[PDB]
Amino acid sequence: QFPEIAYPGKLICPQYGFNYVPGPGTKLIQYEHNGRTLEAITATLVGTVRCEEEKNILVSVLPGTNLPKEGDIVLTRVTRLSLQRANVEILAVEDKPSPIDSGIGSNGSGIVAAGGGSGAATFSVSQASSDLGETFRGIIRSQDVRSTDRDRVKVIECFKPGDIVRAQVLSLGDGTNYYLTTARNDLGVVFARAANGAGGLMYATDWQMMTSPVTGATEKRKCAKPF
C-alpha cells in the first residue's frame, strides 16, 4: 500500500504494480539493496501523496495536509507602454507574494523606487543573485492582448501605467522577460485609478469600460470579468 505522508528521501512505490510515472514533487532514483538493483519513486517535498490516472499513473506530492512557469496565472503592474507592447512587473504567482520582502523603507523617506537609493551602486554582483526588491519582468505583445482582431489593437485603449493586470505565462523568454497573454475572458485589468493614477479607484461597468464613482466619468480598458 502507498504511504500517506512524505518527506525528502522517502521511497513511495516501484515502477510497476500499471506503469508509474513521477509527477511534481517526486523523482526516479536508482537503489542497490542486498546486491540487487532497485527502481523506486522518491519524494522530494514534505506533504501528502496523491495519484491520478492519466495504463499510466502519475504520482505527486502536494505540500500541506514560487517560480513562474508556462500555464501559471500571475498578477502584474504596468510599467511602460509603446505602440507594439506593454512592459509589466510580476507581483504574485498564484496568490503568493513574490518576493516576500518588497524592500519598503530601505531607501529612507519619500517615494523611491527599489533601485533608486544609495545601496543600488554598491551591490555585490558576483556574490548574490539579485538586489533587494527586484522582481521578475514580463512583456505583453499587442497580438497577445486578445485572440481576435489581433492587428487593430490600440495599447493605450487597453492598459495604462500603474494598473493591476491578471495574465498567463506563454513562454520563458530570454533571461530578462517572460512572455504573457491576456486573451481570455478572465484576464485583464482588475484594479485601476482615474487620471492616470492621480485620482480615485474606478469600478468595472462593461467588457470595455470603467466608471469613476465620485464624478461619472468613463475610460476605456480591457476589463477582466468580475464575479
Partner: protein, 305 residues
C-alpha cells in the same frame, strides 16, 4: 466570489486594504487603534561578566541585551577601547557611543540608507540627551611592580565605547526597537580596570576586576511612533484617526504623516519629530501623542528587575 489573500491584497493595493480595515475598527496588523506591542527582554547574558563566579577569558563584550517585540528580534553587544587624551549642562561636556546597525533582508553589499541614518540618529540622540558625561570615561590607571597591581584607591586616558546591533525578522520601522535595546544594554556595562607596566607606554586591561559605568539615570528615555490617516468615504465597508506603533506592509506604504517621540519617566521629552506629508496635523493629535508616549515610557521603565 473573486477574492485575494491578505498578503496579496497588501502587495497590490495597500491603500484600499488600510481603508477597508479601519472602517471595521481594526488594523491590518490585527490590533486596536491605540494598542502597543508587548516587549520581553533578556539582559546581560552574552557578556564576559555574565557569570559572576566564572568569568569568560575569551570574551571581550562588556554589556549585552536581547529584545523581542512581536516577531522582531534585536541583539545588542558593547565593546571598548582606550585612547590617550592629549591636549554645567552644556553639550561640550558629554560623550556618545559609536553604533553599527545591520538589518538582515537578504542583501550582500555595503550599507543602505536605512542603516546609515539609524546609526547616525542613535549617535546624535545619545549626545543630545545628556546621558553620558565625559568625566565618567576617565581612566584611573594603576601600576604593576614586583608582580602585583596597586590602584590609587603624567599621561591621561579615556574609554571608548562601540555598539553592534543586529535586527532579525523585520516587519516595519525599527528605530524605536534599536533605541530601547541600546538603552537596556547601557545600564549593564562594566568597565575593566587598567594598569601600566619618544617613549612606548602600553596600557593593559585587568583580567577579572572591573568597575560599573556611571550614567545620568534620570535622563533615560524610551521611544514610540504614531501615524495619522484620513478616511475615504467611497472605500468604507458596510474625519481622521490616530494609530500607534506602525507595522506590516500596508501601513508603512500608505501613511505619510508620522510622529516620533523620546519621553523620559521624569516628565520631560528629549526628542520630537513631526512630518506632515499626508493628512493635516492638529494640536489635539500632538497632545494625545504626548500623553500616550508618557504612558508607554512609564510602562517600559518599571517592567523588569
Amino acid at each position: 466570489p473573486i477574492t485575494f489573500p491578505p498578503e496579496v491584497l497588501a502587495r497590490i493595493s495597500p491603500e484600499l486594504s488600510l481603508q477597508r480595515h479601519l472602517s471595521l475598527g481594526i488594523r491590518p496588523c490585527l490590533r486596536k487603534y491605540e494598542e502597543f506591542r508587548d516587549v520581553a527582554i533578556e539582559n546581560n547574558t552574552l557578556s564576559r561578566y555574565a557569570d559572576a563566579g566564572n568569568i569568560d577569558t575569551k570574551n571581550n563584550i562588556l554589556g549585552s541585551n536581547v529584545l523581542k517585540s512581536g516577531k522582531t528580534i534585536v541583539i545588542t553587544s558593547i565593546t571598548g577601547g582606550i585612547i590617550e587624551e592629549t591636549s554645567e549642562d552644556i553639550i561640550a561636556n558629554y560623550a556618545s557611543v559609536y553604533p553599527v546597525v545591520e538589518v538582515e533582508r537578504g542583501r550582500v553589499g555595503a550599507c543602505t540608507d536605512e542603516e546609515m541614518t539609524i546609526s547616525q540618529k542613535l549617535h546624535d540622540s545619545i549626545l543630545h540627551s545628556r546621558i553620558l558625561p565625559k568625566k565618567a570615561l576617565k581612566v584611573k590607571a594603576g601600576v604593576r611592580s614586583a608582580f602585583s597591581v596597586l590602584y590609587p584607591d603624567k599621561r591621561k586616558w579615556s574609554y571608548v565605547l562601540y555598539a553592534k546591533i543586529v535586527v532579525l525578522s523585520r516587519t516595519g520601522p525599527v528605530f524605536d526597537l534599536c533605541w530601547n535595546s541600546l538603552m537596556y544594554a547601557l545600564q549593564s556595562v562594566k568597565l575593566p580596570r587598567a594598569f601600566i607596566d619618544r617613549e612606548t607606554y602600553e596600557i593593559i586591561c585587568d583580567q577579572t576586576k572591573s568597575v560599573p559605568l556611571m550614567i545620568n539615570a534620570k535622563n533615560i528615555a524610551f521611544a514610540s511612533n504614531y501615524g495619522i490617516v484620513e478616511l475615504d468615504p467611497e472605500c468604507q465597508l458596510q474625519n481622521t484617526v490616530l494609530i500607534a506603533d506602525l507595522d506590516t506592509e500596508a501601513e508603512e506604504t500608505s501613511i505619510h504623516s508620522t510622529i516620533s517621540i523620546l519621553a523620559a519617566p521624569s516628565g520631560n521629552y528629549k526628542q520630537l519629530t513631526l512630518m506632515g506629508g499626508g493628512a493635516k496635523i492638529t494640536p489635539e493629535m500632538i497632545k494625545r501623542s504626548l500623553l500616550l508616549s508618557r504612558v508607554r515610557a512609564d510602562d517600559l521603565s518599571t517592567r523588569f528587575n
